[PDB]
Amino acid sequence: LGFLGAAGSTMGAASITLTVQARLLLSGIVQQQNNLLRAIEAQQHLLQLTVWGIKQLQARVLAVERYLRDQQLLGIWGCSGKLICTTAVPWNASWSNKTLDMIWNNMTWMEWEREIDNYTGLIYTLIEESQNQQEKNE
Amino acid sequence: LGFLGAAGSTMGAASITLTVQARLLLSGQHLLQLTVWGIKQLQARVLAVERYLRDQQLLGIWGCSGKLICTTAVPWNASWSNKTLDMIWNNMTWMEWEREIDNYTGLIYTLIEESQNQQEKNE
Amino acid sequence: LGFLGAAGSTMGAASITLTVQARLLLSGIVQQQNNLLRAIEAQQHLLQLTVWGIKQLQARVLAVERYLRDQQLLGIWGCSGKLICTTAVPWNASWSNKTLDMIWNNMTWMEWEREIDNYTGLIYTLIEESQNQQEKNE
Amino acid sequence: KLWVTVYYGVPVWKEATTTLFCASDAKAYDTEVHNVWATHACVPTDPNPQEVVLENVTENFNMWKNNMVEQMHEDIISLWDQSLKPCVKLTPLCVTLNCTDLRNVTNISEGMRGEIKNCSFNITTSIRDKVKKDYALFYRLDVVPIDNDNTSYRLINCNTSTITQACPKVSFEPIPIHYCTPAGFAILKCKDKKFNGTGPCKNVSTVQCTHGIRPVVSTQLLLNGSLAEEEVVIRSSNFTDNAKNIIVQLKESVEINCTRPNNNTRKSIHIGPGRAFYTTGDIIGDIRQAHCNISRTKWNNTLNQIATKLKEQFGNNKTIVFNQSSGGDPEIVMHSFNCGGEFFYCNSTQLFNSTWNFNGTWNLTQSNGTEGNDTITLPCRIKQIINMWQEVGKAMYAPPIRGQIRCSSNITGLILTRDGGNNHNNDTETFRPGGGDMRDNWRSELYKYKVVKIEPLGVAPTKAKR
Amino acid sequence: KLWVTVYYGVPVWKEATTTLFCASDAKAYDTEVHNVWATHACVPTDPNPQEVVLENVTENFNMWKNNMVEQMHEDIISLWDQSLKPCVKLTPLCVTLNCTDLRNVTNISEGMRGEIKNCSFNITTSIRDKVKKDYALFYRLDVVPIDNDNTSYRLINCNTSTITQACPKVSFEPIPIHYCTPAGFAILKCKDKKFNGTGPCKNVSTVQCTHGIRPVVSTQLLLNGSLAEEEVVIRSSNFTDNAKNIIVQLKESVEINCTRPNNNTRKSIHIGPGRAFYTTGDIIGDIRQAHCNISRTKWNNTLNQIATKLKEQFGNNKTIVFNQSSGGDPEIVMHSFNCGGEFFYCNSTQLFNSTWNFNGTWNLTQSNGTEGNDTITLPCRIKQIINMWQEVGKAMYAPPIRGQIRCSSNITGLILTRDGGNNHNNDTETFRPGGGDMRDNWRSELYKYKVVKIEPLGVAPTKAKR
Amino acid sequence: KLWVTVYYGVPVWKEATTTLFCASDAKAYDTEVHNVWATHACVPTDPNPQEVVLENVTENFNMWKNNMVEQMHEDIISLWDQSLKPCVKLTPLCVTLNCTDLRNVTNISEGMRGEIKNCSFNITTSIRDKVKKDYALFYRLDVVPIDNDNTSYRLINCNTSTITQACPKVSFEPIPIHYCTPAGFAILKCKDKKFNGTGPCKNVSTVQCTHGIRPVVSTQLLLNGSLAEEEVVIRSSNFTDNAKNIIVQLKESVEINCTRPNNNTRKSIHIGPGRAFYTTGDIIGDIRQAHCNISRTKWNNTLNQIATKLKEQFGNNKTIVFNQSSGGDPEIVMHSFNCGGEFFYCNSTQLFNSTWNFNGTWNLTQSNGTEGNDTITLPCRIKQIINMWQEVGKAMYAPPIRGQIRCSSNITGLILTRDGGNNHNNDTETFRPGGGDMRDNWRSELYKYKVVKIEPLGVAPTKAKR
Ligand SMILES: *[C@@H]1O[C@H](CO)[C@@H](O[C@@H]2O[C@H](CO)[C@@H](O[C@@H]3O[C@H](CO)[C@@H](O)[C@H](O[C@H]4O[C@H](CO)[C@@H](O)[C@H](O)[C@@H]4O[C@H]4O[C@H](CO)[C@@H](O)[C@H](O)[C@@H]4O)[C@@H]3O)[C@H](O)[C@H]2NC(C)=O)[C@H](O)[C@H]1NC(C)=O
Ligand SMILES: *[C@@H]1O[C@H](CO)[C@@H](O[C@@H]2O[C@H](CO)[C@@H](O[C@@H]3O[C@H](CO)[C@@H](O)[C@H](O)[C@@H]3O)[C@H](O)[C@H]2NC(C)=O)[C@H](O)[C@H]1NC(C)=O
Ligand SMILES: *[C@@H]1O[C@H](CO)[C@@H](O[C@@H]2O[C@H](CO)[C@@H](O[C@@H]3O[C@H](CO)[C@@H](O)[C@H](O)[C@@H]3O)[C@H](O)[C@H]2NC(C)=O)[C@H](O)[C@H]1NC(C)=O
Ligand SMILES: COc1ccnc2[nH]cc(C(=O)C(=O)N3CCN(C(=O)c4ccccc4)C[C@H]3C)c12
Ligand SMILES: *[C@@H]1O[C@H](CO)[C@@H](O[C@@H]2O[C@H](CO)[C@@H](O)[C@H](O)[C@H]2NC(C)=O)[C@H](O)[C@H]1NC(C)=O
Ligand SMILES: *[C@@H]1O[C@H](CO)[C@@H](O[C@@H]2O[C@H](CO)[C@@H](O)[C@H](O)[C@H]2NC(C)=O)[C@H](O)[C@H]1NC(C)=O
Ligand SMILES: *[C@@H]1O[C@H](CO)[C@@H](O)[C@H](O)[C@H]1NC(C)=O
């Protein structure tokens, strides 16, 4: 429930006041589903190890691992706050010599990120440097 | 003082000592061979983790993101067993507060997160 | 990558520059390597309750436990922020009657951290009480 | 100038692999008796399915490299393995058998069938010193003559492998199963009316769980499966490569009425401490062979719909042939399936006997007043011992079921196999029944779904400075 | 007006269920001897127990639907199954036995007991080719007359149930166990002096872990168990219903001195590659029946203690009757327990033959002139083969123990069953020893504890705006 | 005045224990050698190892209570047990054997060796009434004489326990393994040129993964191991305690060329459904005994090196003695190892026959023109059945390998045993080959590494107020 419908929507149009509210609603729904799963299973004690029991345990471990990964990254470079977060690194236009308005009105998130993957390494490394910078400025 | 020592005392005094409970639920025989109690302990610790991170997630999703204390914007409805303040603070306990705020607690939770989304929309 | 090489250098000299620069190299690089290993492992699959699958499963479970525990510790006393955190607790000179210059430019971390292995519990509990007082004021 | 800005929770995913779990809501769990292997494990299904419709999306699909197929394939295999593992081992019953004809040569109602054999044999009891000469009943398909002797016989797979009987309490009635992903992943569903199995898809939807599959394994014809829409749809990895199989999905169900008209007695003999082999006691009344009832008109109409689409595939100017199966092991050569825990083997020769003329079809069988020779009766037989389809060994005996047995199910799909030869100018493309693969039955059901991992962190250059 | 204010870590808990793990202490791990029970699996117990007393709390308790009693029982059964799973299988030894009286007719010291039987038999050796006629000593309880005559015998369970002997290296000496909850849960302890098992409780404490239980399975009696303080407490699910079992807790220990006065030899015979059946070699000296020693005045003091509390329960004007169970299974009918890996069956008829009267009661035995007929001596016997109490299958064999066996334990509680009949105006309430249930032994141990989940998040209005 | 200030990520470790996992590069997986007792379960090793130099730390080490030794010990034990657990059971073959000379009395080329025995025997197959009189081949080491007639024989391990043959598809070639810790821990490496095994260390380096070990177990010798630097090094818990073993690390590799000059045929006989015992068909050509080729001068010079370090250890004025082992089980008494899936037992005499005098050494044999009696030939023999070293049960049979077998490896270390006696004024310290321990082989590898947990959080007063 609350899965984003902005997958077809153009990244920029979708990002402004169309996807931010849904993103947090989606997180709340997944949290409610996880709570429902953990309470029913505890009441049933049907979690005794068997092939299905191993398959569901692994899936839960993977899920928590993945979420913790995301939150871990998100915190460790200074965005402990909310989904949207600015940063200090100037965006070297060389990465994609393209203008903002056209990209926002025409490009979508999936096709956007797949031609950025080359420079994603560079931008993230520059970000960690900006964190270091501001921490040795304070 | 104590994991459940505050219980008998009123909610206001419980708030002062609410940090000793926050240290509990930490959720942390390094080898875990598939024998008997070893796996029992593994399953138990794996559950405890979900419990914490569930509560943690709600906090972050709400306007709180920070532990022990957090205030809100939803007005309290008369309908939700409204009394006074000396009543709901200096007279009665957290345990039996749940008794009358139980079908209401879910209504209150839905209210807080709808307002939190609404304030984000306004910002 | 980015491991601890400041142990030999006096606590103070490491604290002024090395701890700040290494912090991110210690928080991000280690986590990124773990994430890459997990992603390749999940795609490879072949994760059965064999002699080895159980070992690495417990390994990553221990890893997540230890990381989460540190975050809970920092979060409960107000270090929900980052590396550098002050406190309101005055350092009792009865615990350790040593001048700052000797503590910083003569003594390192391992030797010093062992010296407080009796006062440490008292210190932390006081940090919790001070945090509660700040909660009352705001 | 710009500074990068990040957005957690952007609509981005990536084709990936992961583990899945099942869901059996609560109807199976309510009975709490004769628990099936799937029932006591699956997590209750969420009452409200969520199917978010996606627009302006042309994601590519290819079912022949779908990871979830193989995963669920080894899932079902391991589940059966553990489900049957702890119960009885049948290795000591492998001796010589002294057998008569049926109950008696006194037959009214088919004659000498040979399907009971009243085989006698010497066996060792639970007490080591004690030994007893006992008798039991067996079908022709469950015994091989040995020693060139009319009286001598042995089980089929003694000199090959081992056998362990099915464990009597557990039921063999399938139930719907819903595969559900853990968080951070989603399943994409291609909702287009027609899809050939590989390519871009216009109608795309996002779900967290699949619809119930109700796992059924059959040879030649799909059963209790899903239906196509507005027409029959064919899927092949490479139509020019005749070596690969053909997948057929029908747009109407076809009712099939199979039964085992015999009153049976479950006589139980002990061969060990907990070892209690279950055999047939006797038969009350005449021995009528098991059979399936099928309508004629409906069959023609649906098979003619197939003919047109198959013609359309390989060029208009063709003549169609439906020869019977070449040969081999019993499953692929002759129609087989399961019903109430009894494995039926039906002779579907009369089912595939058709030669559509390039210029004789397009006229269905619209016989309104029928009231007669309208039911297609299938000669069906019983085999109690069944081995692993892929593994050479690992066999399993089927305990007899007391009383009368009858199922009625829904034929939803066929499995076809094109054979090349003198069909170039003849234009006589011949199709024979197929099977023998555990993956294809479910390939027929998983083509519409595919799993994607969800990567929410995204980056966007923006001129805002912190 | 008010705005809700969130608070993490508040005293709300909730009735709940969860999984628990044991603690055996560092010392059990330090001995590291044969992993008796689950010595290694158990986590080292915490040095400092934490028992935060809770005041102002009236929590209700009910031990008859406490789930951890069921949890503990299943855990014990699983641990025993794991211990006996790799043990030597004993199925082949089930043959006919050719038995003499015991050893010899040269009895002095009790006469014809029949407890050795020097049974001989024909058995296959490790090598299939060689078969050797061997012997073994067996108690009268172990072998039933079979095929009638006089000289044919066989084990009690053969066709009925398989047997696997106890592995020799492991020991059965129980050790204290501490159940400990994972984080987010707690155990509540009702600390009141007298509790009838269900109702509100005044004195309450939250504890990190339960005290050592040292699980002991015994019938008609409770050994090595917790003692009620300052009173004797009688508990039952339904006092009105005679069928419901009655549990009696005691306020003093009673010392019991059981022994097996026989010097034994462990003769070991191979029946397979790793199969090494262990039997008794012979007996050095005279054969004396096992005998438990018990003081008179002390047991009587406790019989009077039961009486008073019992006639305070069912109305003053009653006459009390103590009768043994007329019909029962061998474990149920008479007293049985374990000692040094040897299962004793004692005839507790002299502990349950008392007719307390309404008048003349309340005077205790203050006999200062003792030094004599002051020991209740119990006729005790040995059974080596014991079967699952509940499941009709899965029997074990007890290997013999060399040398002398002696125990001295601590009698702390009773199980009694009320029987109804001509007791209305007679007022002759009759009570009989009970047992045969694995749960009841631990129902008394876990009565004061109950588990609760802890939910930290609470919400309360306050006028502070953010 | 000061207020404490907290830091997250200070350089503070602590002595600790934890679990580790492996990393077998990709090369074994790139070859698909079908899971050689530890392949597909390992994670791919990181391309770029990170060995951070430590400065100004004198961390103490002690290898004799390093836990990872024991951990990896039991790891190897369970890893081997689970590989041979699912394949063939080899109990039924234990019968009497009727055996000839070798294959034939026609011997050219050594004479009466007795190493083939052409043993015949009656056995039972899958079908259990068709007894089969079959033959096979066995070595003199594999078969014991029971009944000292002439041609009456049995497999040595039928009194002890059970046998299960190695499962043919899996190979035995070891591959490098890298132990890697989970996050929050590190491994410290003592990089000093010479280390006695216990004490402070000057050169320290933190890695996260150990270098490949390539697990190899051998007795009296160390093979394809690691090398010392500039000198032979010598380690012992208590040198005075002659009871403890002595580990010797070498500074040069020594080439060893072992071979099995016999063309072999793998004749396969079924004894069950899936039971297919593999035996030797025959030998093509002459029977040349397996042997190992070793250079003289290298061995002499390296033995000189050890002697000098040993007369630095126990005082200069000594005379050195190298007597052969005392006795016992085959492994430690005479040299043994593995090669291409065949366990060789080489007669170690010519190696340890040396009495380097107090006044006769210090001249290495630098023989230039040799071209002759320069190769040390080792009489080596074959045993196919090998048991557990410590436990008495759990034995395996090694299937024969077809064709020619030949390995060439690098000797790198020694195990020795000091024997005391009349050596005080004689000064004739005598040392013999050792072995029989699984730990020591790896103690020789893991001496340099030790694990430490990392706790990042540290406190320090500072005058800054919040
Ligand atoms: C456990 O403790 C109990 C309590 O002490 C023991 O049982 C008690 O036994 C005494 C008798 O020893 C009994 O007292 C009798 O009570 C009856 C009713 O209250 C009275 O009828 C009786 O008076 C006389 O008559 C009885 C026959 O009707 C005689 O049996 C009895 O001995 C009395 O005999 C009188 O006359 C003779 C001869 O002149 C004289 O020697 C006697 O002293 C007496 O004057 C008694 O008052 C208690 O009622 C019993 N109590 C209970 C609870 O049963 C029991 O033995 C102890 N068990 C063990 C193992 O030690
Ligand atoms: C219980 O029954 C067993 C049989 O299962 C008896 O064992 C047998 O006892 C006889 C008599 O002592 C033994 O024969 C003797 O052997 C010695 C030594 O060679 C010889 O000197 C004597 O003349 C006589 O032949 C026999 O070996 C022995 N067998 C075994 C397997 O132990 C046993 O004596 C009986 N014990 C009692 C107490 O009744
Ligand atoms: C391996 O290395 C050792 C070390 O050199 C060789 O040992 C010995 O070498 C010396 C010098 O050749 C021999 O000394 C002889 O001493 C006797 C009495 O003192 C006398 O005849 C001469 O003075 C002579 O130099 C010595 O015999 C010899 N062995 C001893 C006992 O030390 C050894 O030869 C080398 N080779 C092999 C294959 O063993
Ligand atoms: C004989 O094996 C077994 C048979 C049955 N159950 C078992 N359970 C563990 C086993 C072992 O692991 C073992 O005892 N083994 C000895 C050490 N070993 C070697 O490689 C080796 C052998 C000889 C000389 C030097 C090294 C591995 C293995 C063969 C084991
Ligand atoms: C439990 O509740 C009682 C009743 O309020 C508390 O007893 C009072 O405590 C206050 C302050 O400690 C005293 O001033 C009163 O005189 C006490 N008695 C009363 C009000 O009757 C008690 O302290 C509470 N204990 C806990 C642990 O919560
Ligand atoms: C280890 O100790 C040595 C000796 O003090 C350090 O070497 C000197 O370090 C200081 C400051 O760290 C420099 O000013 C000197 O120039 C260095 N040279 C000398 C005199 O040796 C070394 O840096 C220390 N290593 C660490 C980083 O712990
Ligand atoms: C960005 O700059 C490069 C300079 O080489 C130019 O070639 C490219 O066309 C520019 N992008 C656009 C779309 O203007």
* DSSP code per residue over B17-86: THHHHHHSS--------SSSHHHHHHHHHHHHHHHHHHHHHHHHHTT--SSS-EEEEEEPPTTTT---SH
- Considering only the beta carbons, identify the residue of B54, B61, B65 that sits closest to A38: B54
Distances (CA, A) of F199 to E263, F64, F244: 55, 12, 19
Q: Can you list the positions of beta strands (E) in E49-94?
A: 51-54, 60-62
C-alpha F302 – ligand 3 centre gap (Å): 15
- What is the C-alpha to C-alpha distance for residues E306 and E234, in angstroms, rounded to an integer? 8
Backbone dihedral region for residue A94 (phi beyond 0: left; psi -120 to 50: alpha; all else: beta): alpha
Residue with tokens 């871990």: A72
Looking up residue D254, the CATH number of its domain turns out to be: 2.170.40.20
The dihedral over CA atoms of D383, D386, D390, D393, expressed in degrees to the nearest 10, equals: -130
How many Å apart are CA D220 and CA D332, to the nearest integer?
A: 7
Residue contact A83–D8, C-beta within 8 A = yes
Distances (CA, A) of D181 to A63, D41, D207, D209: 10, 16, 10, 7
Q: Which of F412, F218, F373 is nearest to F295 (CA)?
A: F373
Query: What radius of gyration do chain E's Cα atoms show?
Result: 26
Residues F211 and F225 sit within 8 Å (Cβ to Cβ): no
Strand D185-190 relative to strand D449-454, pairing: antiparallel
Q: Which helix (H) or strand (E) holds D382?
A: strand D378-382
Q: From chain E, pick out residues whose CB is under 8 angstroms from the CB of D276.
A: none
User: Are D138 and D263 within one domain?
Assistant: no
Provide long-range contacts, Cβ within 8 A and 24+ apart, for A17-20.
A17/B121, A19/D9, A19/D10, A19/D11, A20/A83, A20/A84, A20/B120
Q: Return all residues near B106 (Cβ < 8 A) that are at least 6 apart.
A: none
Distance CA E103, CA E100 (A): 7
Contact D157, D385 (CB under 8 A): yes
DSSP single-letter state for residue D340: T
User: Residue D35 is encoded by which pair of tokens?
Assistant: 């628990």
Return the residue of C nearest to A129 by Cα: C24
Helix (H, G, I), strand (E, B), or coil: what is residue B1?
A: coil
* Rounded-to-integer distance, Cα C97 and Cα D157, Å: 87
Instruction: Compute the radius of gyration of chain F from its Cα atoms.
Output: 26
Q: Is residue F171 part of a domain?
A: no
Is residue D240 classed as helix, strand or coil in its secondary structure?
coil
Place of tokens 């002990």: D270
Report residue F158 as tokens. Answer: 């039928």
Chain F contact set for D159 (CB, 8 A) = 126-127
- The whole-angstrom separation of Cα D458 and Cα A113 is 7
Return the residue whose CA atom lies nearest to atom 19 of ligand 4: F217
Measuring CA to CA, which residue among F214, F210, F188 is closest to residue F201? F188
Spatial CA neighbour of F141 closest among F343, F338, F6: F343
Give the largest CA-CA distance in chain A: 58
* Both structure tokens of D464: 């805002």
Chain F residues touching B42 at Cβ < 8 A = none
For chain B, how long is the longest CA-to-CA vector? 56
- The closest alpha carbon to E13, from C117, D381, B94, F298, belongs to B94
| Partner C contacted by D17 (CB < 8 A) | yes
Burial class (CB within 10 angstroms; exposed 0-12, middle 13-18, buried 19+) of F215 = buried
Structure token pair of residue F266: 């793998």
Q: Regarding beta strands E430-433 and E321-322, do their DSSP bridges make them parallel or antiparallel, or are they unpaired? A: parallel
State the Cα–Cα distance between residues E1 and E465, nearest whole angstrom.
10
Task: Quote the minimal CA–CA distance from D199 to chain A in Å.
Answer: 18
- Inside any domain, residue D328: yes
Phi and psi of E300, rounded to 5°?
A: -65, -40
Cross-strand bridge partners of residue C34:
none
Q: Is D403 helix (H, G, I), strand (E, B) or coil?
A: coil
Q: Is residue D228 part of a domain?
A: yes
CB atoms under 10 Å from CB of E311, counted, come to 19
Interface test with D, best of C32, C44, C45, C49 (most D CBs within 10 A): C45
A48 lines ligand 7 (CB under 6 A): no
Q: Which residues on adjacent β-strands are paired with residue F418?
A: F431
Q: Which amino acid is at F118?
A: N
Distance CA(F350)–CA(B78), nearest Å, equals 100
The dihedral of CA E215, E219, E224, E225: what is its sign?
A: positive
Give ligand 6 pocket residues (Cβ under 6 A).
Answer: C 8-9; F 55-56
Regarding the beta carbon of F152 and ligand 3, being less than 6 Å apart is answered: no
Q: What is the 3-state secondary structure (H, E, C) of F234-295?
A: EECCCCCCCCCCEEEEEEEEEEEEEEECCEEEEEEEECCCCCEEEEEEEEECCCCCCEEEEE
Task: Confirm if C52 and F24 have CB atoms less than 8 A apart.
Answer: no
Is C31's CB within 8 Å of A136's CB? no
Burial group, residue F48, by CB count within 10 angstroms (0-12, 13-18, 19+): exposed
Q: Tell me if C67 and A72 make a contact (CB, 8 A cut-off).
A: yes
Cβ contact (<8 Å) for A67 and D183?
A: yes
For residues D429 and D339, membership in a common domain is answered with: yes
Q: Which two tokens stand for residue F153?
A: 């024989």
Residue F132 lies in a domain: no
Decide: F135 and F126 in contact? Cβ < 8 Å: no
Q: Which residues of D touch A26 (CB under 8 A)?
A: 9
Paired tokens of C75 = 């979060």
Structure tokens at D427: 């234009």
Distance (angstroms) between ligand 4 centre and the Cα of D250 equals 59
Give the closest ligand to the alpha carbon of residue E363. 1
- Residue F133 CA to residue F143 CA, distance in Å, equals 19
Backbone φ, ψ for residue F386 (5° rounding):
-130, 135
Rounded CA gap, B18 and B68, in Å?
7
Backbone phi, then psi, for D309, in 5-degree steps?
A: -65, -40
Distances in whole angstroms, Cα of residue B47 to Cα of each of A44, B26, C61, D148, E184: 14, 12, 12, 65, 10
D127 Cβ under 8 Å from any chain E Cβ: yes
Nearest-CA residue of chain B relative to C132?
B16
Residue E319 placed within a domain: yes
Which chain C residues touch B68 with a CB distance below 8 Å? Answer: 76, 131-132, 135
Q: Answer yes or no: is D162 within a domain.
A: no
**Separation of alpha carbons D214 and F353, rounded Å:** 76
Tokens standing for residue D190: 């291609």
Count: domains in chain E: 1
What residue's CA is closest to ligand 3, atom 1?
F300
Q: Over the range D381-415, which residues count as b (16 or more CB within 10 Å of their CB) and which as e? A: bbbbbbbeeeeeebbbbbbbbeeebebebbbbbbb
Q: Reduced to 3 states, what is the DSSP secondary structure of residue E155?
A: strand
Do residue B36 and residue E41 have CB atoms under 8 angstroms apart? yes
Which residues in F154-172 are b (16+ Cβ under 10 Å) and which e?
bbbbbeebbbbbbebebbb
**Tokens representing D186?**
């989603």
Are D180 and D70 members of one domain? Answer: yes
Ligand 3 binding pocket includes F5 (Cβ within 6 Å)? no
Q: How far is CA E56 from the centre of its chain?
A: 37
How far is ligand 7, taken at its centre, from the CA of residue A112, in Å? 17
Q: Are F201 and F189 in contact (CB under 8 A)?
A: no
Give, as one character, the DSSP assignment of residue E322.
E
d(C-alpha D189, C-alpha F442), whole Å: 54
CA atoms within 13 A on the CB side of E281: 10
Report the alpha-carbon distance of residue E191 to residue E53 in Å, rounded: 9
Three-state DSSP state, E123:
strand
E123-128 long-range contacts (CB < 8 A, ≥24 apart) are E123/E92, E123/E93, E123/E95, E123/E271, E124/E92, E124/E271, E125/E270, E125/E271, E126/E270, E126/E271, E126/E272, E126/E273, E126/E275, E126/F94, E126/F158, E126/F159, E127/F94, E127/F95, E127/F96, E127/F154, E127/F158, E128/F92, E128/F94, E128/F95
Is the distance from CB of F398 to CB of F384 less than 8 angstroms? yes
Domain extent, residue D104, equals 95-154
Backbone phi, psi, residue A65, to 5°: -55, -45
Asked if the C-beta of D16 comes within 8 angstroms of chain C's C-beta atoms, the answer is: yes
Rounded CA separation E354/D5 (Å): 90
Look at the block and give the residue holding tokens 């063309």. Answer: F263
DSSP state of E293: E
Q: Are residues D287 and D397 in the same domain?
A: yes
Q: What residues contact E313, with CB distance under 8 A and at least 6 apart?
A: E234, E239
Rg from Cα positions in chain B: 19
Contact call for E454 and B29, based on CB within 8 A: no
Contact indicator for D413, D356 with CB cutoff of 8 Å: no
User: Residue F173 in contact with residue F36, Cβ under 8 Å?
Assistant: yes
Residues D246, D220: Cα–Cα separation, whole Å: 11
Residue recorded with tokens 């221990």: C62
Which ligand 7 atom sits closest to the C-alpha of A97?
Answer: 1
All residues at 6 or more sequence positions from F201 whose CB lies less than 8 Å from its CB, including other chains: F58, F59, F60, F61, F190, F191, F192, F195
In a domain, E259, yes or no: yes
**3-state secondary structure (DSSP) of residue A38:** helix
A22 near B117, Cβ under 8 Å? Answer: no
Contacts of D127 in chain E (CB under 8 A): 94-95, 154, 158-159
How do the residues of chain F divide into helix, strand and coil, expressed in percent and rounded to 5?
10, 35, 55
Total count of residues recorded for chain E: 466
DSSP D278-318: EEEEEEES--PPPEEE-BHHHHHHHHHHHHHHHHHHT-SS-
Residue E254: inside a domain: yes
Instruction: Return the CA Rg of chain D.
Output: 26
Residues in chain F: 466
Taken as a whole, chain B contains a residue count of: 123
Number of E/F CB contacts below 8 angstroms equals 23
- The partner residues of D264 in beta bridges, in order of sequence, read D283
Structure-block tokens of residue E424: 């209305």
Who among C58, C73, C91 is closest to F2 (CB)?
C91
